[PDB]
Structures are given as C-alpha cells and as structure tokens.
Symmetry: C3
Subunit: 229 residues, 3 copies
C-alpha cells in the first residue's frame, strides 16, 4: 500500500481486449489476411502479463539495495525479436524457399537485446559508460546493413514492393533509435533522478510503438486481394 | 546427509534406460514410425539429468532463507513445449507446407510456462494470489482456442483423423488441468506445509504423464503401414 | 583499478575485424559460398561482446563472496549450438526437405551446455564430482551416436562427401573432448588454484577452435563450382 501503480495495470487491460478484437473481426478482415493480426496478436498477449507485473513490482530483485529492471529487458528479449519478424511477413506475402536473410535479422537482434539487459545490470558507474557505447555502436553497423536490402539497383525489379518496404523501414528506424536517445539521460544511462518519470517514459514509448505499428501495416500494404488457405 | 533423497534418483534412472530401450527396439517399431519415439526420446533425456539434480539438491538458490524451485520450472520450460510439439507430429504424418498454427501453439505455451516460473518466485503472500489466477485464466482462453481445431463443420472431411485428435486432446487436457488443481494447495499455492509431500506429488504427476503419453500414442494411431525415408 | 585484463579485450578486437574482412572479401570468395562465412560471421560478433565484458569484469555475480562464471557459459549457450549448425551447412550444399537429424544435434547440445553452466554453479565440493561425471557421461552416448552417420555401409553411396565429413568430425572431436580434459583440474573441476591461469586457459582454447575452424572448412571442401541465387 506504500507503492502502488495503475499505469502498467491499464497497459495489460488494453492488450487483452486487443487480441479479442481480432476474434470478432475475424469474420472478415480489412483486405490484409489474418497473418498480420496473428503476429500482432502474440505481441500484446505476452507483454500484457509483463505489464501488470510491473504494477505489483513483481519480477524484480534488489541487488545491493538497487532495484534492477529485470521484467523490462525480459519482455524485450521476446517481444522485440517478434516485432522484427512481423516485418518479414509484411513484405513476404508467400514462401517457397527457406531464406537466410531472416536468420541474419534474428541473430543481430539477439546481440542488441543483450546490450539492453546488461546496461541495467551495471556493477559500477564506470563500467556503465563502456557498455553504453557498445550498445549504440552495434546499432550503427546494423543500420548500414539493414539499409542495404533497399538496393538502388534493385529498384528496377519492382518499385511497388520497394515503396512498401521503404515506408515501414522509416518508422521502424525512428523507434529503434528512440530508445537509445532517452537512455542518454535517467537511470542506467547517466542520470540520478526519480524512477517515477523513468518507468513512465519507457512505458509510453513501447505503447506508442505497439499500436503505432498496427495501424502502420494497415495503410502500408492497402490491398483488396484476399487469398484463403 | 540430513536431506538426502532417492525419489529423483530413480527418476533419471528410468528415463535413461527409456531412450536406450528404443535403440535396441529400433530394429523395428510397433507399426508407428521412428519420429514418434524420436521426440519422446529427448523428453526423458533432458528431464532425466534435471530430476537427478533434485535429489542432490542442486539448481536451487537460498534467497533470504527461502528455497526456490528454480530447476523445477526450468525443466518445465524445455520439456513441456516439446511435449506439445509431439502432438503436431502425431497429427501430421508428412509435411508439405509450413503451417502457421504450429507457431500460435508454441507461443501460447511460452506464456503458460512464464506464469509457472513466477508462481514460485512469489515475493509476497498477496502477490501470489494475483499471479495464480492469472495462470489459470491464461489456460481458459487457450482452452477455448485449442478446442477449436476440431470443428464440427470439418467433420465432413475425415472422421478418422478427427477421432485421432479427439482421444489425444482428451488426456492432454486432464494433465494440463492436473497441475492447476494441485496448485490450489501447498507452497506457492496457498498452503504452508512440509516440502516433502510437495515435491513428492509434483514429481509423481509428471512421471504419470510421461510414460502414460508414450503408450497413449501407440494405441492412439495404431497403424500397420510403415514408410521409409 | 587493480583487477584489470587485456586478453579478453584483444579478443573482441580480432572478432570484430573478422566479420568486416568478409564485407570487403565479399566481392569474391575462395570458392566456398557466403553461407560458410555467414555462420562464421555471427559467431565472432556475439562472442566478441561477451569477451570484452570479461575484461571489465562484467556479467558475473558475487555469490557468498564467490565469483561465478555466469558470462562464461552464457556464450557457450548460443555460440556452441551455432558451431554445430555450421557443420550441417558444410555437408548440405542445398536443402529440399526438412530433416530431423538437425534436431537431434541441437537437442543433445542443449543437454551438454546444461552440465557446463551448472558445473561452475557447484554449491558443494561433493556435488561438483557428481555433476562432472554427469557431463562427460552424456558426451559418451552422443559420441557413438554422432559417429554413426559415417556408416561403413553407406560408403558405397559417395566416397567424396564421406571423406569431407570424416575430416570435419576429426578436428571437431579434438576440441569437444578438449574442454572435458582441462576440467579435471582447476576451479569447478577439482583444483584450488589462482583464477588467473584458469581464465587464461579457457580463453586461448576457444580462440584456437574459432580461427582454426574457419580455415578448416576452406581446406575441407575446396571447390571451384560456385552457384548464385
């Protein structure tokens, strides 16, 4: 009764009803097959349980008197990668041969989330300065590489599929770069301030990315051609 | 020497000889292909070494003088998902196209296991009651969705393949519901009692479902038409 | 300040530049397709970050005044498994149907790693002797099983491919057996000596298998036939 929250509580509330909204709208989709709603169904479910937990402050251990954001990165080890996989399905409306490109995105993602779970596990104020630089640096090499698929020479192949991927990649970068920015200040990122505003900022951001990604794909593809299985 | 056990010891002993039993019987199976014993081979192997540890009292950490069932859920995070995957193989003889339902199943399971590992990691006597109802509730939505595959309208397709999944899910539910029941009483489930009967019940149940599942599929499919690679 | 390293530092240095060498050499490979350098690209990247950490003494925890090799096995939980995956690619130049043998290796692997992470998590001096023998034991049964694919009856099928996997498994066994050997002495393996030597030995060994495995495949296949996609 000394420390109660209602931000993470309502978080899971909207997530639960989200997946359910697909159960009713399943009678007929808005042009885009259920495949999109599928991956977008698991993201809210899992994260939901993790949110309500943050409310009761469950899933955190007091190391050296300092509270670690264990529940924060854990959800960022399963949700984020899944958020990366949803992109693969967005462009790939069908599969015929096992691609290796997907394996490149999955592996590189694991390396990023690693720098995120260790950042909060800083043992000293000096070590936190080293790992921090390693996190952003990783995103650099990954940015130049993820920006390769959009070859300027392949633009002759199909401009249609190129435009779609060019629109979803834009908002994608804004998010992935968003977190690294806010990290510049606050806890576990140079900044000794209250943990109230911190948990409030890292809460509203993922949300702005969750729902924002849903409506994004809707206008991204914009197709009226349906195909049953 | 003041807390020795022989229950978990015999556990791994029976699992080890189990996989080997297939190595000799591999000369020829009971009509059912080797893919069945394959998945059923990894289950006892991994879980085997896990239980053996429970005997030596390993894989457990003493936090604040409180013992945690760390190794308990661990085996339930790798074995259970595999116990689910086996169902997909028993219902699918040969694959020709990558399904998506297999993903929604493996995902929803990860959610269930999550509530299981946290259930024991209760930080308060009040937070435990909350995380508890969350686990069962999660099984509710999954129960209505898992019971969907057997559509009454798709019965016009094949009554043979249907009756196969019917008998399978039947016993599958009794088990999945079994644990949630015993949880009502005992540690990590509202019940301050000895840890002897606790580990004695939670150990006998998995074993009752381990061997019971093997003989189940044998009579479940019952086929005399084998196919080589 | 006092406890500083430099071996793990140069470790990541050689790994980062490695993957970069492929970026420039990508213009044309030494006969072997990029698939080989693909898996050989992620292995050094991830491990790199894990190494530099060992230098700044990050990733470990102080349990009862003791230092656990947490980050040590961590890399051996994702890297090692991939080390096997690379082997499946060197043998299969093209896939047409999903195999089950691939799952047999990946599964049995998780089992070995389990004994590797718990070996250092020994809570007693007696339990360490029990967990140790358990690890090498599992390595025995898998040894005969992995030595099976090279059947003497299938020699009449293809001597070319048979010779490739024969030379590949040779060096592969030398390393897999290497670690089990050194474990007979030192911390977490019967031996109360300075951690300076232990950390220095388990450092050069992996590096000896990292770069050694790269050039190994180059001379293993040695093909001039290239195929594009």
């Amino acid at each position: 009764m000394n420390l109660e929250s209602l931000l993470h509580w309502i978080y899971v509330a909207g997530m639960t009803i989200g997946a359910l909204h697909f159960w009713s709208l399943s009678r007929n989709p808005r042009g885009v097959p259920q495949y999109e709603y599928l991956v977008a169904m698991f993201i809210p479910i899992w994260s939901g349980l993790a949110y309500m937990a943050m409310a009761i402050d469950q899933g955190k251990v007091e190391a050296a008197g300092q509270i670690a954001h264990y529940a924060r990165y854990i959800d960022w080890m399963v949700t984020t990668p899944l958020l990366l996989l949803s992109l693969s399905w967005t462009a790939m409306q069908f599969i015929k041969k096992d691609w290796t490109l997907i394996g490149f995105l999955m592996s590189t993602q694991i390396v990023v989330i690693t720098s995120g779970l260790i950042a909060d596990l800083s043992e000293r104020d000096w070590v936190r300065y080293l790992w921090y630089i390693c996190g952003v640096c990783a995103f650099l090499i990954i940015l130049w590489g993820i920006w390769n698929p959009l070859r300027a020479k392949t633009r002759t192949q199909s401009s249609e599929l190129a435009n779609l991927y060019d629109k979803l990649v834009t908002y994608f970068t804004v998010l992935w770069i968003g977190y690294p920015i806010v990290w510049i200040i606050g806890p576990s990122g140079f900044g000794w301030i209250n943990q109230t505003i911190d948990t409030f900022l890292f809460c509203l951001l993922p949300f702005f990315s969750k729902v924002g990604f849903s409506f994004l794909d809707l206008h991204g593809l914009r197709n009226l051609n349906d195909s049953r299985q």
